[PDB]
Design a protein around this ligand. Structure first.
Ligand SMILES: C[C@H](O[C@@H](Cc1ccc(-c2cccc(Cl)c2)cc1)C(=O)Nc1nnn[nH]1)C(=O)O
Length: 303
């Protein structure tokens, strides 16, 4: 069993490197952030441009959706996060507190909290309603590349250039686990699996790893792509077959059979590093995005 992803739409508009792409949970929209200090909203099924959201003073590294698809959270080099009401385009809150670039962000499933990570080596937990910082965790000894909440929001997974993945108790802020393989390459990305038993981590030694968090064991390894420098997102594709999807420094989208770990498809088309990919929550759609030499988002579909 192999998928058949084929290019359907190319989305131009960003004037600088695209940093992240995310589909709304309701499946209606695609959000993109860029080094151009802007967030763009696109139609998930046709790639039709909807709107631009601006206000950040420097490049945006990440964007994330709230569970009801009404809010966006963005992380910027202007050392803030911003909470946006998508429909009205308004900036609800500006989260000030990090001392360096904010590199990653996410909402919890209940979307009353925001987790953020920064070049200041900390993980912060914010109140969505007030925009106040509830906890500052002295999480790592190098920049925090990714942060993500589990299925019920009781755990936060963080990764850093220091070579570690750490699991934090949302309520106490105590470190529950430190995950590392025998090698120490910088960990550029991490995320909990859709149902939360696993963690998918990306290292800067051209490797994707699937860990069983509880047992502290690496269960699967996915190789064949190139990733020695950039914080490339990776994803679980679960609408058709069960796959692992990731961008690559060789300008391709790689797709792996999750169980067998073999490459099932490679998507050719971008002219620069595929920095980010996203999988549609209900349809076999992959959104992919590239750096400065390309500046486009591509929408691929499988039948
Ligand atoms: C179905 C979809 O996602 C799945 C993705 C998945 C699928 C399979 C394996 C896995 C792990 C170890 C060995 C092997 Cl042979 C497979 C790992 C992840 C998921 O989240 N499973 C999940 N999370 N927590 N507990 N079960 C969804 O939940 O919509």
């Amino acid at each position: 069993v192999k998928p058949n992803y084929a290019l359907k739409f190319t989305l131009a508009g960003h004037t600088k490197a695209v940093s992240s792409v995310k589909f709304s949970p309701n499946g209606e929209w695609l959000a993109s952030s860029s080094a151009d200090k802007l967030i763009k909203i696109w139609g998930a099924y046709d790639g039709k441009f909807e709107k631009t959201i601006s206000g950040h003073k420097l490049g945006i590294s990440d964007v994330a959706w709230s569970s009801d698809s009404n809010l966006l959270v963005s992380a910027s080099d202007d050392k803030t996060l911003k909470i946006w009401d998508v429909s009205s385009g308004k900036c609800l809150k500006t989260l000030k507190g990090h001392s360096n670039y904010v590199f990653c962000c996410n909402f919890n499933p209940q979307s009353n909290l925001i987790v953020s990570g920064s070049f200041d080596e900390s993980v912060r937990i914010w109140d969505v309603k007030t925009g106040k910082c509830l906890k500052t965790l002295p999480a790592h000894s190098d920049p925090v590349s990714a942060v993500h909440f589990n299925r019920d929001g009781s755990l936060i997974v963080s990764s850093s250039y220091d070579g570690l993945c750490r699991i934090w108790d949302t309520a106490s802020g105590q470190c529950l686990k430190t995950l590392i393989d025998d090698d120490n390459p910088p960990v550029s990305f991490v995320k909990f699996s859709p149902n939360g038993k696993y963690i998918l981590a990306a290292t800067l030694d051209n490797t994707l790893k699937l860990w069983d968090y509880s047992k502290g064991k690496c269960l699967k390894t996915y190789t064949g792509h190139k990733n020695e420098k950039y914080c490339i997102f990776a994803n679980f594709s679960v609408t058709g077959g069960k796959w692992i999807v990731s961008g690559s420094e060789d300008n391709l989208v790689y797709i792996w059979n999750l169980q067998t770990k073999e490459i099932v498809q490679k998507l050719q088309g971008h002219t620069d590093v595929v920095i980010s990919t996203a999988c549609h929550p209900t349809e076999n759609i992959i959104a992919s995005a590239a750096l400065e030499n390309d500046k486009t988002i591509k929408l691929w579909k499988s039948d």
